[PDB]
Amino acid sequence: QEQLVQSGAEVKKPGASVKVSCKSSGFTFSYFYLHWVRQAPGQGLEWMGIINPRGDGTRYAQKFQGRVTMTRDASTGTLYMELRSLRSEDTAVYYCARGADHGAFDIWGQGTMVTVSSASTKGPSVFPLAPSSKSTSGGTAALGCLVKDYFPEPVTVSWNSGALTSGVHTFPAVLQSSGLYSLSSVVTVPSSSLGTQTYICNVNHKPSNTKVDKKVEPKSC
């Protein structure tokens, strides 16, 4: 019941600022020192700074001083981090955390994803990865969908409206030099059934209100 709940995902242009919030429940908000920590994609944890219980004292990591402002509102029980002059290296998940009396971070928020990029919202193009004898082992064939050139994250991929789950591998997205993301989703299936079973990948990109169903047609040649 002791909880920290953070605001939703953010997408920002370089040079902008972002203000993330973190609201407590189940404990006396004003008793505790509070923190922000961030984690860049695939990287480790990096402490950003601390704010004292009253809210009139802060100390920030040397890297962020001059660019970050931490505040708290006792009337709403809410903690804030504002990070200014954003650059693409500020792309990360940002966590709020409670400092216990012993100093370690005993309650954590769920994280807020912040994307900083020049790119504009764009839905993906979905292309088939058709099965063939070049995708067929001893009775097992691989097929998939290439989900290319979208921004921002995330996309979701399902197969046959969720009826096909076994053997599916949906790869993590990779950022291309264009600033757009791309990923592939693959599945291995019995080759004997390629002519009597239909395989459709369902791609949803909520930021662009894009929905794409792509039938992946086998190649007899």
List residues near other proteins by CB under 8 A: 33, 35, 37, 44-47, 50, 52, 57, 59, 95, 99-106, 108-111, 125, 127-130, 134-135, 137, 140, 142, 144, 146, 148, 169-174, 176, 182-184, 186, 188, 221
By C-beta, is 173 or 194 nearer to other proteins? 173
Tokens 């912040």 correspond to 114
By C-beta, is 85 or 88 nearer to other proteins? 88
Neighbour count for residue 153 (Cβ, 10 Å): 18
Nearest approach in angstroms of CB 63 to other proteins is: 11
Contact 190, 131 (CB under 8 A): no
Distance CA 60, CA 43 (A): 20
Nearest approach in angstroms of CB 218 to other proteins is: 13
Enter the tokens of residue 178. 């264009």
The dihedral built from the CA positions of residue 92, 115, 94 and 146, taken in this order, carries a sign that is negative
* SS3 at position 207: helix
CA angle 177, 178, 184 (to 5 degrees): 80
By C-beta, is 91 or 182 nearer to other proteins? 182
By C-beta, is 85 or 141 nearer to other proteins? 141
Nearest approach in angstroms of CB 4 to other proteins is: 9
Nearest approach in angstroms of CB 18 to other proteins is: 19
